[PDB]
Structures are given as structure tokens and as C-alpha cells.
């Protein structure tokens, strides 16, 4: 059982909004994680890195555990959750919550010809976190994901088939790497290509249409 406590979540349980595209259309702030678990069911998870961190006391070394979790459907949705906790499997569980809440769309595209169901990214896009910068460059069919193992997985779970990557900075700082890759794939829908130039009329939000139910 759930019992929602947020307008959006009311509409999701009711089944008024069906898909997450209606959320992303209107930039609806997602606060409950079960919103996403309902809409986007087949959403695999994986733990990238667990890292001990340590605060110094007069006791000595008081250790928490920082888990880095990546969710995704392998079909244009991905998320990234970072959490640190007293216990390990405590951190993982709360990570998958944050990963779910972070989930965003990935504008996939074609490297060249407009052939048959998009395989690469639309454009070149970068993200920077800390020292780390990750550039993602569209690749032809059969290239695979040309990335380091950790970035590879985030791109597999996003549902990219073929892409080139170049990094710069301390790539060994894995939290910062994945966050920068995550900003990159985030920015795919940021970039205004010419095919998105056509002026649409602004659709009305479900938080006005189905207002009574909320």
C-alpha cells in the first residue's frame, strides 16, 4: 500500500496521467518515488560504487557509506541517486529512491541517415562536474558504447546503442564522472535543433484539467 500525499501522486494513483511524458512536458516536480514506479514499471537498478567516508572525532574514525545508484529502462529514461548512510544496504535502498526521483528523458537520434528507429544521440553534448567533463558524440551503427565501464552502464540503462565519449579531468573521481555523464544525457533535450523550431500552442497541465481530483 502507498497512500499518496502530493497532488501529482493523486493523479497517478487515479490513473489520469498515464505516462511520464506528461510530467516531463510540464516540468512537474516529482516528490514521491511511487509516482515513477507506477508509470515506468520495468526500471532496472544497479549499484556503481560504494565508498567509505570518515568524519574525525575525539573518538576517531566515524565511518558512513556513500552508495551511487543508477536506474533506467533501457528505452530513453535514466536516473542517478547518491546517498550516504550508517549502514551499506540502508544507503543502497535510499539511493534507489533518489535515483527514481531524479529520472529524466534522453533525446536519442541518428548519426546520419533517418533510417529505422534512433540508435545514437541527436547531437554532441557535454556535462561538467568538479574537474570532470564528459563529452558524448553520436556514432554510426555497430560502434557500441565507447566509454569507460561506469559511464557505459549509465548509457546502456539510458538505452543508447552507439556513442563515442571523450572525458577530461580526474575521471577516477567516479561520483563526479557519473554526475557529469548524467548532466550530458540530461542536456540532450536542452539543445534546440531546427526540427524542434515549429511553434506549438502550449498544452494545459493535468494540475488544471483534473483539478477536482487533486
Amino acid at each position: 500500500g502507498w497512500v499518496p500525499v502530493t497532488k501529482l501522486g493523486r493523479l497517478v494513483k487515479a490513473g489520469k496521467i498515464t505516462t511520464i511524458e506528461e510530467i516531463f512536458l510540464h516540468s512537474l516536480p516529482v516528490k514521491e518515488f511511487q509516482i515513477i514506479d507506477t508509470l515506468l514499471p520495468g526500471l532496472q537498478d544497479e549499484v556503481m560504487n560504494i565508498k567509505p567516508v570518515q568524519k574525525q572525532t575525539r573518538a576517531g574514525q566515524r565511518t558512513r557509506f556513500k552508495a551511487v545508484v543508477v536506474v533506467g529502462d533501457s528505452n530513453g529514461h535514466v536516473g542517478l541517486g547518491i546517498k550516504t548512510a550508517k549502514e551499506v544496504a540502508g544507503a543502497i535502498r535510499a539511493g534507489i529512491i533518489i535515483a527514481k526521483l531524479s529520472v529524466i528523458p534522453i533525446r536519442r537520434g541518428y548519426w546520419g541517415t533517418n533510417l529505422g528507429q534512433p540508435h545514437s544521440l541527436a547531437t554532441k553534448t557535454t556535462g561538467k562536474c568538479g574537474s570532470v567533463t564528459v563529452r558524448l558524440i553520436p556514432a554510426p551503427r555497430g560502434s557500441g558504447i565507447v566509454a569507460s565501464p561506469a559511464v557505459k552502464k549509465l548509457l546502456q540503462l539510458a538505452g543508447v546503442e552507439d556513442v563515442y565519449t571523450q572525458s577530461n579531468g580526474k575521471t577516477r573521481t567516479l561520483e563526479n564522472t557519473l554526475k557529469a555523464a548524467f548532466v550530458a544525457i540530461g542536456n540532450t533535450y536542452g539543445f534546440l535543433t531546427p526540427n524542434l523550431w515549429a511553434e506549438q500552442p502550449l498544452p494545459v497541465s493535468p494540475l488544471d484539467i483534473y483539478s477536482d481530483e487533486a
Partner: peptide, 10 residues
Amino acid sequence: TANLLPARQF
């Protein structure tokens, strides 16, 4: 064009 432009399309 490979170096400068975001895609092959535009």
C-alpha cells in the same frame, strides 16, 4: 564539419 558542428544533420 565533423570538428565544428553538433551533428551531421544541421
